[PDB]
Structure formats: structure tokens, C-alpha cells
Design an enzyme around this catalytic site. Sequence first.
Site, PDB file in Angstrom:
ATOM      1  N   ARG A  45     -10.313 -11.079 -21.066  1.00 40.59           N
ATOM      2  CA  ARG A  45      -8.996 -10.490 -20.885  1.00 40.59           C
ATOM      3  C   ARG A  45      -9.064  -9.016 -20.510  1.00 40.59           C
ATOM      4  O   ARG A  45      -8.269  -8.494 -19.741  1.00 40.59           O
ATOM      5  CB  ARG A  45      -8.212 -10.587 -22.163  1.00 40.59           C
ATOM      6  CG  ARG A  45      -6.727 -10.407 -21.927  1.00 40.59           C
ATOM      7  CD  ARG A  45      -5.905 -10.292 -23.200  1.00 40.59           C
ATOM      8  NE  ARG A  45      -4.509 -10.428 -22.829  1.00 40.59           N
ATOM      9  CZ  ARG A  45      -3.497  -9.634 -23.158  1.00 40.59           C
ATOM     10  NH1 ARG A  45      -3.694  -8.581 -23.926  1.00 40.59           N
ATOM     11  NH2 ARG A  45      -2.267  -9.904 -22.721  1.00 40.59           N
ATOM     12  N   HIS A  49      -7.373  -7.440 -17.294  1.00 40.09           N
ATOM     13  CA  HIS A  49      -6.400  -6.376 -17.431  1.00 40.09           C
ATOM     14  C   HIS A  49      -6.716  -5.061 -16.687  1.00 40.09           C
ATOM     15  O   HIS A  49      -5.815  -4.363 -16.225  1.00 40.09           O
ATOM     16  CB  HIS A  49      -6.096  -6.049 -18.886  1.00 40.09           C
ATOM     17  CG  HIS A  49      -4.935  -6.809 -19.447  1.00 40.09           C
ATOM     18  ND1 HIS A  49      -3.967  -6.212 -20.243  1.00 40.09           N
ATOM     19  CD2 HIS A  49      -4.612  -8.121 -19.322  1.00 40.09           C
ATOM     20  CE1 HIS A  49      -3.093  -7.159 -20.564  1.00 40.09           C
ATOM     21  NE2 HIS A  49      -3.451  -8.323 -20.033  1.00 40.09           N
ATOM     22  N   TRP A 188      -4.339 -22.095 -27.159  1.00 39.21           N
ATOM     23  CA  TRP A 188      -3.956 -23.020 -26.102  1.00 39.21           C
ATOM     24  C   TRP A 188      -4.674 -24.354 -26.209  1.00 39.21           C
ATOM     25  O   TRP A 188      -4.330 -25.330 -25.547  1.00 39.21           O
ATOM     26  CB  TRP A 188      -4.237 -22.467 -24.689  1.00 39.21           C
ATOM     27  CG  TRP A 188      -3.363 -21.343 -24.240  1.00 39.21           C
ATOM     28  CD1 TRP A 188      -2.174 -21.438 -23.564  1.00 39.21           C
ATOM     29  CD2 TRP A 188      -3.621 -19.952 -24.418  1.00 39.21           C
ATOM     30  NE1 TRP A 188      -1.675 -20.178 -23.318  1.00 39.21           N
ATOM     31  CE2 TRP A 188      -2.548 -19.246 -23.833  1.00 39.21           C
ATOM     32  CE3 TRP A 188      -4.669 -19.248 -25.027  1.00 39.21           C
ATOM     33  CZ2 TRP A 188      -2.511 -17.848 -23.851  1.00 39.21           C
ATOM     34  CZ3 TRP A 188      -4.634 -17.874 -25.044  1.00 39.21           C
ATOM     35  CH2 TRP A 188      -3.565 -17.189 -24.461  1.00 39.21           C
TER      36      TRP A 188
HETATM   37  C1  DDH Z   1       1.327 -14.713 -16.037  1.00 37.05           C
HETATM   38  C2  DDH Z   1       0.051 -14.318 -16.200  1.00 37.05           C
HETATM   39  O1  DDH Z   1      -0.584 -13.907 -15.227  1.00 37.05           O
HETATM   40  C3  DDH Z   1      -0.440 -13.991 -17.614  1.00 37.05           C
HETATM   41  C4  DDH Z   1       0.295 -13.749 -18.701  1.00 37.05           C
HETATM   42  C5  DDH Z   1       1.782 -13.405 -18.779  1.00 37.05           C
HETATM   43  C6  DDH Z   1      -0.605 -13.715 -19.837  1.00 37.05           C
HETATM   44  C7  DDH Z   1      -0.194 -13.278 -21.076  1.00 37.05           C
HETATM   45  C8  DDH Z   1      -1.150 -13.482 -22.051  1.00 37.05           C
HETATM   46  C9  DDH Z   1      -0.857 -13.109 -23.404  1.00 37.05           C
HETATM   47  C10 DDH Z   1       0.569 -12.961 -23.972  1.00 37.05           C
HETATM   48  C11 DDH Z   1      -2.004 -13.125 -24.099  1.00 37.05           C
HETATM   49  C12 DDH Z   1      -2.223 -13.090 -25.627  1.00 37.05           C
HETATM   50  C13 DDH Z   1      -2.393 -11.667 -26.189  1.00 37.05           C
HETATM   51  C14 DDH Z   1      -2.573 -11.537 -27.695  1.00 37.05           C
HETATM   52  O2  DDH Z   1      -1.567 -11.576 -28.441  1.00 37.05           O
HETATM   53  O3  DDH Z   1      -3.719 -11.278 -28.131  1.00 37.05           O
HETATM   54  C15 DDH Z   1      -3.062 -13.518 -23.205  1.00 37.05           C
HETATM   55  C16 DDH Z   1      -4.294 -13.833 -23.738  1.00 37.05           C
HETATM   56  C17 DDH Z   1      -5.388 -14.014 -22.919  1.00 37.05           C
HETATM   57  N1  DDH Z   1      -5.363 -13.868 -21.553  1.00 37.05           N
HETATM   58 FE1  DDH Z   1      -3.618 -14.055 -20.475  1.00 37.05          FE
HETATM   59  N2  DDH Z   1      -1.877 -13.960 -19.418  1.00 37.05           N
HETATM   60  C18 DDH Z   1      -1.798 -14.264 -18.068  1.00 37.05           C
HETATM   61  C19 DDH Z   1      -2.840 -14.331 -17.181  1.00 37.05           C
HETATM   62  C20 DDH Z   1      -4.164 -14.347 -17.545  1.00 37.05           C
HETATM   63  C21 DDH Z   1      -5.257 -14.466 -16.604  1.00 37.05           C
HETATM   64  C22 DDH Z   1      -5.193 -14.572 -15.064  1.00 37.05           C
HETATM   65  C23 DDH Z   1      -6.377 -14.373 -17.289  1.00 37.05           C
HETATM   66  C24 DDH Z   1      -7.809 -14.323 -16.751  1.00 37.05           C
HETATM   67  C25 DDH Z   1      -8.158 -14.726 -15.518  1.00 37.05           C
HETATM   68  O4  DDH Z   1      -8.581 -13.674 -17.427  1.00 37.05           O
HETATM   69  C26 DDH Z   1      -6.050 -14.399 -18.709  1.00 37.05           C
HETATM   70  C27 DDH Z   1      -6.962 -14.355 -19.758  1.00 37.05           C
HETATM   71  C28 DDH Z   1      -6.584 -14.294 -21.081  1.00 37.05           C
HETATM   72  C29 DDH Z   1      -7.492 -14.451 -22.222  1.00 37.05           C
HETATM   73  C30 DDH Z   1      -8.926 -14.996 -22.084  1.00 37.05           C
HETATM   74  C31 DDH Z   1      -6.754 -14.301 -23.332  1.00 37.05           C
HETATM   75  C32 DDH Z   1      -7.129 -14.542 -24.810  1.00 37.05           C
HETATM   76  C33 DDH Z   1      -7.475 -13.223 -25.495  1.00 37.05           C
HETATM   77  C34 DDH Z   1      -7.815 -13.317 -26.959  1.00 37.05           C
HETATM   78  O5  DDH Z   1      -8.046 -14.466 -27.410  1.00 37.05           O
HETATM   79  O6  DDH Z   1      -7.825 -12.180 -27.499  1.00 37.05           O
HETATM   80  N3  DDH Z   1      -4.670 -14.353 -18.851  1.00 37.05           N
HETATM   81  N4  DDH Z   1      -2.531 -13.641 -21.904  1.00 37.05           N
END
Ligand code: DDH
Length: 291
Positions: A45, A49, A188
Site C-alpha cells: 500500500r 500511495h 477482504w
Molecule cells: C479505488 C481505489 O483505487 C482504492 C481505494 C479507494 C482503496 C482504499 C483502501 C482502503 C480504505 C484501505 C484500508 C486502509 C486501512 O484502514 O488500513 C486500503 C487498504 C489497502 N490497499 Fe487499497 N484502495 C484502492 C486501491 C488500491 C490499489 C490499486 C492497491 C494496490 C495496487 O496496491 C491497493 C492496495 C491496498 C493494500 C495492500 C491494502 C491493505 C493495507 C493493510 O492491510 O494495512 N489499494 N485501500
Amino acid sequence: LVHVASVEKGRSYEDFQKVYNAIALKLREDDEYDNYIGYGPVLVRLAWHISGTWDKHDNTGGSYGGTYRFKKEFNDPSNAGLQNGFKFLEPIHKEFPWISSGDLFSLGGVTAVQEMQGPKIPWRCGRVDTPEDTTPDNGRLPDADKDAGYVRTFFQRLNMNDREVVALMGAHALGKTHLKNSGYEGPWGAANNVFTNEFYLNLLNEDWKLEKNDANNEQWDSKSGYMMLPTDYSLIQDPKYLSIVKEYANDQDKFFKDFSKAFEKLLEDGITFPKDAPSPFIFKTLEEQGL
Ligand code: DDH
């Protein structure tokens, strides 16, 4: 704005492989994190980000500059929770101070995916730290309470098409949401620290119920104890998205290939690689090295 990739002076693949190995060994070691999920997810993430702030219209943001290191970016609300990934990498940087920040943050994502059994992701070095002044403003990352149209539109700013968007979202198989961080709670799926096409399977196979959470936000909840954000859910609501989802649900191999290409593209957006730049490196995992 042009950002030309500049290799860290005198470093080669071997030099990179070492950084990868250190991150990987640390991942192996610090397994208690987040109730035993490990830091794999958070690192993926973080790489996503620091890269999602990019704007193809003016070339600002993206991974090049390592701007996450600055307060403005570091403190972005959409970045809540990323600080743990940073803290994890801190000592690594200390051990390898010649690495640029954008290169380190991005490489951690790659290491994470590969050590979690995902596909190999070719990676390029050359990112250069930029001044505080280049830090993009907060607000460039996506909202989760929206729909497919929003998602489509959003992703276009990063130059990603339908297929890329769906591939990329399969990263949601990893980790979980945390109430305190985003206003969402739950994982998930079940194999949350192993890279698989679980995400698609779940979205197509569970009996999802829309409900409000403790933060007063809606989320789709399953009997199995899983959740989906509105944006995740929208992938089955859109016709075009849905058939890609099904394809990934059916062929993990396809998914991995597509994911790989997109993630690299995502981490390389906004950057210009000179003719004489080395090819992308493919790192060996710990396991491949017998370590
Ligand atoms: C609409 C979108 O594009 C989008 C949204 C909106 C969205 C919102 C959330 C939110 C909310 C969280 C949770 C945060 C928390 O409370 O800790 C969150 C957690 C994780 N993300 Fe995500 N994400 C989207 C796109 C991507 C993408 C493209 C990726 C990627 C390619 O990496 C990727 C990878 C990962 C990962 C892995 C996590 C889990 C993190 C954790 O566990 O700490 N995400 N993401």
C-alpha cells in the site's frame, strides 16, 4: 516537468539485490505485526500511495521524488497508517543510505509482493529525491465510498485503462481495513498475506450484505466475515469491469501477468528513462537464493 531517472552513482543490480534481501529478511522476522499478518500488505500500500499522487496532465506527483518523506504528504489523511510501513523501512535506509527514497519505497512494494508469493515484478532504479517544495497537495488519492464511474475517471489521471484498474485492485486480497485508519473495518478474504486471485473469487462468490459500520460508513459484508468497499463492489456492478473480474477469478496466471505489468507501470509513471539506462531488474526471492 521532466524527471529523468538517474542511477545511484556506481550501483549495480547486486547492490539492489542486497537491499531487496534486507527488506525481505526483515519481513520474515517481524511477523507479529497486525495480528500476524506481517508488514507485506502495508508495504504494498505504501508503494501504491506514493505513486498514486501522480497527475498525467502536468507530471506532478508520482514516485520519483520520494516526497512522502515530507510532512505535508506524510500527514495526508488518505495516508493514515502508512507510517508503520515507513518505520519498517527506516533501519533499512540507514543500512543503505545511498538509495534514494522513491527507490526504497517502491522497492519495498515489489519485495512484498514477491515474498508473498506474487508474481515477479521488474523494477527500475533511478528515482531522485526532490525538494520539499515538490510535495503534491493532499487530496490526490481516491475515495472509497464511490462507484465504478468515479473509479474509471480517477484511474484515467494515472493513465490506466479498465484492465489495469481491475488488475490493480486485486491487491485488495492483501491486508485489511482498519477502522481507526480509514473508517472501514475487516479483511477482504482469508489468505491475507499470500498473493492470490482470492479477491475476485470472493467478490463473485460471497453473499454480500450492505451495512453501515461503526464509523457510519457503508460496506458490503459477507457471512464468511469478509468485507468489500463500495469501490471494490462497483467492479461487479459495471459490465466492463465484471467480465475482467470473472476472467481473473478464472485464471490466476492471467491475473498475475496483468498485475505485474500494471504495477510496474504504476511505479514508473512520470518518469523518463534514458536510452542508456539499465534494463529493469528482476530480483531473486530469498527462497531462490537459499536464504
Ligand atoms: C479505488 C481505489 O483505487 C482504492 C481505494 C479507494 C482503496 C482504499 C483502501 C482502503 C480504505 C484501505 C484500508 C486502509 C486501512 O484502514 O488500513 C486500503 C487498504 C489497502 N490497499 Fe487499497 N484502495 C484502492 C486501491 C488500491 C490499489 C490499486 C492497491 C494496490 C495496487 O496496491 C491497493 C492496495 C491496498 C493494500 C495492500 C491494502 C491493505 C493495507 C493493510 O492491510 O494495512 N489499494 N485501500
